[PDB]
Structure 1
Amino acid sequence: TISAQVIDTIVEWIDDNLHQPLRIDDIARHAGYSKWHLQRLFLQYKGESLGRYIRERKLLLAARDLRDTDQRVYDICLKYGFDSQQTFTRVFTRTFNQPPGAYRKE
């Protein structure tokens, strides 16, 4: 029990939320937690910044949609959180060091 069961709610919010980005103001409101409700969790249970963890989660979620043989490549990053194509391209290039088409063909 950390801050009255915030771990059991963060995962549910991440799984049920839409492609809306997750920031301090967005998440803290109806999350049941303060900025400090989440800082201690991100420091202890995860030990990683939010901008990197959210990007990794989006990449792991899109790894299946890229294999689902979808022709609308521009909408894949949009349906999962990336509001722009260039941001998703840079994130994928810095993470996997591979072009988007090279991983989409696989």
Structure 2
Amino acid sequence: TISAQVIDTIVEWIDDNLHQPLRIDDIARHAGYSKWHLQRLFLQYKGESLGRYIRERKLLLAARDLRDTDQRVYDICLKYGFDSQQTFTVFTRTFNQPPGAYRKE
């Protein structure tokens, strides 16, 4: 029990939520835990900054949609959180693996 069961709710919010980005103000509210209700968790349970963990989660989620043989490549990053194609093109810094070649795999 950390901050009255915030771990059991963060995962549910990440699962249920739409492609809306996750920031301090966005998740600070209906979360039931403010900035410090999340800082301790991100420091202890995860040990990684939000901008990298969210990007990794989006990449792991899109790894299946890229294999689902979808022709609308521009909408793949949009349906998962990346509001722009250039920002998602994160993939170069993470995998150094072609968008298209991976999409071909």
User: The TM-score by the shorter chain falls in which range?
Assistant: over 0.9
C-alpha separation in 1, matches of 2:40 and 2:25:
17
In the TM superposition, what is the alpha-carbon distance from 1:99 to its structure 2 partner?
1.3
**Structure 1: runs of 5+ lacking an equivalent:** none
Deviations 1:47-84 (A, max 9, x none): 00000000000000000000000000000000000000
Which contiguous aligned blocks of 4+ residues in structure 1 show a shift greater than 6 angstroms? none
**Structure 2: runs of 5+ lacking an equivalent:** none
In the TM superposition, what is the alpha-carbon distance from 1:27 to its structure 2 partner?
0.2
CA-based RMSD of the aligned residues comes to 0.2
Bigger helix fraction: 1
C-alpha separation in 2, matches of 1:99 and 1:74:
15
Q: What is the percent sequence identity of the aligned residues? A: 100
In the TM superposition, what is the alpha-carbon distance from 1:32 to its structure 2 partner?
0.5
**How many residues are paired up?**
105
The equivalent of 2:12 in structure 1 is 12
TM-score (ref. length: structure 2): 1.00
2:78 is aligned with 1:74: no
Deviations 1:6-25 (A, max 9, x none): 00000000000000000000
In the TM superposition, what is the alpha-carbon distance from 1:98 to its structure 2 partner?
1.1
Equivalences for residues 1-106 of structure 1 within 5 A: 1-89=1-89, 91-106=90-105
In the TM superposition, what is the alpha-carbon distance from 1:93 to its structure 2 partner?
0.1
In the TM superposition, what is the alpha-carbon distance from 1:40 to its structure 2 partner?
0.0
